[PDB]
Amino acid sequence: KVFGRCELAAAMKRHGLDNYRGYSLGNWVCAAKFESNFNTQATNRNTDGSTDYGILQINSRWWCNDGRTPGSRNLCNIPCSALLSSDITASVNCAKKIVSDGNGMNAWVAWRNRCKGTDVQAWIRGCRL
Ligand SMILES: [Cl-]
Ligand SMILES: [Cl-]
Ligand SMILES: [Cl-]
Ligand SMILES: [Cl-]
Ligand code: NA
């Protein structure tokens, strides 16, 4: 599923991400935009063989099981395929665990490089929330 901007904002807010660990909704929407262009089915292979999945490009090296990432962990205790659903619950629940682990949203390199320190509220501007 390819979400609209405001559609994804509303879905994220309903799933508890708004100000989760202090990160306003615009931060999460901005991260999703540059990780996946709002496409739940996005996948991207990393150089070391792990794979990133879903709207927030969550990595099989640590967070989900895809059966093909040797030595990896599955700290969200989910199949990586769960991260590609039209329903964003698994991605949100895993993102909450990631952003709580110590480095906040810097875990998403694209958030650090493209969202951090910018006017992230622009990503929710105009949305009925
Ligand atoms: Cl915001
Ligand atoms: Cl990540
Ligand atoms: Cl594996
Ligand atoms: Cl933080
Ligand atoms: Na894994």
Curated annotation (Swiss-Prot):
Catalytic residues (UniProt): E35, D52
Binding annotation for substrate: D101
Record-annotated disulphide pairs: C6-C127, C30-C115, C64-C80, C76-C94
SUPFAM superfamilies: Lysozyme-like (SSF53955)
Residues annotated as transmembrane: none
Database matches in Pfam families: Lys
Keyword entries, A-Z: Allergen, Antimicrobial, Bacteriolytic enzyme, Disulfide bond, Glycosidase, Hydrolase, Secreted, Signal
Enzyme Commission number(s): 3.2.1.17
GO CC, any one term: cytoplasm
Catalysis performed (reactions): Hydrolysis of (1->4)-beta-linkages between N-acetylmuramic acid and N-acetyl-D-glucosamine residues in a peptidoglycan and between N-acetyl-D-glucosamine residues in chitodextrins
Protein's UniProt name: Lysozyme C
Protein source organism: Gallus gallus
Taxonomic placement: Eukaryota, Metazoa, Chordata, Craniata, Vertebrata
